[model samples]
Target chain A: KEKHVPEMKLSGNHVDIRCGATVMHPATEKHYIGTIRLFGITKEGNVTLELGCQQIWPGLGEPVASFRVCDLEKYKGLLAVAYCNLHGCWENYMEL
Target chain B: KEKHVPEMKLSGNHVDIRCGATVMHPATEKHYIGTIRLFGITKEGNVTLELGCQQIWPGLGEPVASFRVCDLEKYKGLLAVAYCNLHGCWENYMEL
Candidate 1:
């Protein structure tokens, strides 16, 4: 669970999902962030949008999952997960 | 393909791929990098390694594709493609 928990931010036009806020996980040939999944939830917990990262930038880039927001009023919260080759999966959540 | 050819570098054990070397192509809510693909072949012409980036860093991150090479010597060259949400595809090849 803690292995892949990322950070979330709701911008005006996009939902920002990021991994490794303070401690950037060392992303190298040996270990790196692999995949990221994102989901937007309505007030009743209905998923409005779903997207993911199939792979990521090599040589240590920020592990981020971001998507354009179509209707902010349509979603009440966000749920995201990031996978690390070395760490498995981490999940995070934020209220819209 | 001119649609996706990017700048590349062979760093110690990794390959650095960068798009928008000069222009940076404007990665924003309007237009952004969508995906990237990386492939390495043996001198004999092999598809030894394949990697994909499902997404990119938003806010104008260069549309780039990079991968780790096990036997760079075995590969005759590298091939990659980058895509822009607005543009279609661009490709680049580097000989080993």
Candidate 2:
């Protein structure tokens, strides 16, 4: 599910992150994205940073979930997880 | 002080929450909101729920941060904390 995969865009020392499945899984009270998380990873596969976004309601067809990450040199890359209440969690990643 | 406080609006079983001090403290790499948190409190001052928003960069005047909370009846009310990298944390609340 490409729609469920979180996307990352790096600019300067900051990275813009976003996630949504608005097309396949329209956000609704019964079935919607509940949480989206971001993780920073080292080349050895160690997690260096962890952050979260909790979407509590069904609106905007998506969780308005976006995060801006700074200090790029901390990790080798990044990974993200977007969790849907009905569909479970989906993952994606990027390398620095 | 008011600008640092988080704001909440309730509708149906959902609660709309937002935080920013765009007027007084602009979002910047050196001085910006690093996180915003919400706590569900019982009348006894016991916290039953906790959620957070981590703003990592210095792009928007605010964090582009907003959250929609559902199933509001679980607590007596709600409390919010918005933390700035330079100014520390500020709190505000609402009663159900």
Candidate 3:
């Protein structure tokens, strides 16, 4: 008998999962490990996560989620998108 | 008198003077020359200045003025302040 392991989901524009897990950058392949707190949304439409400050780069300021605020109104379902600005601008939609 | 030279004023929280002149950083002794256009305040209290993009750093983003916006209302005269964040946070006041 195999032990149960929760599977990751990829659907719609939103990615909902448990916190404190590593989320791979689809493009750069840079690994951003989740810290002591989970800073993402959970399935069941509940938000319970507080990401640690260790992931931030000094002098680079705060890591911010970028999105066109104007487009949010049109999104009917949950929308989760990440952008990369390391070399240049590139946005990748993660599995929801 | 040989010629006329407008005297720079050193008083109050505000620095009101003509633009396009290099104002010395009193603490660091760093010289930031005024470019094609003056990007600071002018008096008789008329605000007109457009700074160019040459002074900006590539990955660092834009240079912003640091100030406590809550203090502005108490100022009877004009206030001009510049903040430096290269090594750390340091603020310098210029002569108007």
Candidate 4:
């Protein structure tokens, strides 16, 4: 589903990411977003500065994942990937 | 690559979409983004509006694909998909 691509917000050097806002894609035993990641791409389009949140349990323990970049201006934009147990992997982006 | 998730810009009801900025993923014979699509999602999470641009050849003919919505406020957000010749399918989104 389109909900698989985690929504994003960027302020200053901080980026907040969240996915599967519904009860169906929550940190449940059957289905959940396993990993939500943020990666930086160079002005030349090379990948760098990889960061991620890994969920190990199925509960209401995990919330929004945030990443703060010290060298944020080094890249053209940010690329995000979220992987669901049943949906494989989904992606989205934000241009800086 | 992360670039496979097409980048988007939404202004008013007009949404513009593009992918493969480099020559690698252009409308070339060996590699290209075959189809770029836009689909609307209901507030209740149902899929409805579906539009796309299908590339038929490898040339410098295609450019950005644009989609305008009539009842834009009816949906929660928009989901986009871009299929590449070798990269399978990639996804991205914008919240309304």
Candidate 5:
């Protein structure tokens, strides 16, 4: 299947979609995982709130995969879609 | 003026919008600028292509702001826009 090349690469639980309404982790160049896209799906189907990126890091530098959202309170029991440049899109439930 | 807080902050020549079709600059936790949004503006107005991020670093780490565009040859006399979560959005011309 001629598919559009993916902007993301990582997949599975290793990849994430969180309620980064808050997070207090740490990152360095060797393990930073870039985070992208903030959207969701529900009974009404797919939806998108806002979009932001974390940028890139030095080669062999760690990958980063974290994000922040001010609007997660707008809905609940919903699902999210997020991806990493190193990891592809993966689905996850509450607790992100 | 009721304004939307910007995703980028640097202005004037202090911020950059580079070709980065190629760059070899070194980055670390002290100066890793997170780059987001890769779009351009012209006589026809503004446009956006691919987007990505570099994630976050430990407090006081440096910042990152850059992007890679495969279609740079698609248009000319065009400009780009990039933002840093810590610094907000900034702009510059082709020379970046």
Candidate 6:
């Protein structure tokens, strides 16, 4: 028998973010349910996250998120986010 | 009347050195008359040197050398030299 998992929806707005040819979501848009943090994009369009097993969050401590590349069309050329702790959630788009 | 300048010959063996598609000379062969030191190559086949005007040799204190890209078929595809304080003189070849 297969287990049925419930889908979770994120609550917030989408912000424009970009790095070189890559794009990231605005810090004010996305929200972290647990202690998850989005990091950077690879040259092959892979999302990097700082997965921490120990933090202030309970239950599953592993960071997880799903995003599509078809989104994020505004910001496409910027530097990495240095200050993101107080900026709320983080997300982005990337194209190879 | 135009002054005729005589060419000075370098007395040392040629060492094979390459970085990506560029190449440099062997440090064990060349000799420094003043305090000249070779640096790195640019993407457009230009050579860089550590030209110092103080602390050691005199006589205009400028590093100068001439090299051809046709040489150096051995050591290719390497990182930049990190240490060369007692490694004699430096020279290299580059191609765009």
By TM-score, the best candidate is: 2
Which lDDT tens digits does candidate 6 get at residues B1-96? 211111223223222222212222123322213322222332333323221111223233223333333333332321122122223222333322
Candidate 2, which segments miss by more than 4 Å at Cα?
Answer: A21-24, A43-45, B1-34, B37-81, B84-96
Against the true structure, candidate 3 has what lDDT? 0.26
> Model 2 chain A, poorest ten-residue lDDT window?
A55-64
Candidate 6 fnat reads: 0.00
* By TM-score: ranked, best first: 2, 1, 4, 5, 3, 6
RMSD of 4: 12.5
Q: Candidate 3: list runs displaced more than 4 Å.
A: A1-14, A17-75, A92-96, B1-96
| Candidate 6 segments exceeding 4 Å error | A1-33, A37-56, A69-71, A77-96, B1-96
TM-score of each: 0.50, 0.52, 0.17, 0.44, 0.28, 0.14
* Candidate 1 residue lDDT tens string, A1-96: 233467776668455565666565556677777766666676655844554354664532446545554445677776777878777888787777
What TM-score does chain B alone reach in each candidate, compared with the true chain B?
Answer: 0.73, 0.71, 0.20, 0.78, 0.36, 0.20
Interface RMSD of each: 7.9, 6.4, 15.4, 10.2, 10.1, 20.5
Q: Which candidate leads in lDDT?
A: 4
| lDDT tens per residue, model 2, B4-89 | 66666655534444554344345665777766666666545576566445444443334434444444555687777778777789
- DockQ, candidate no. 5: 0.05
Task: Sort the predicted structures by DockQ, highest score first.
Answer: 1, 2, 5, 4, 3, 6
- What are the lDDT scores of the predictions, listed in order? 0.61, 0.57, 0.26, 0.65, 0.35, 0.25
In terms of docking quality, model 3 is incorrect
Model 1 global lDDT (CA atoms, 0 to 1): 0.61
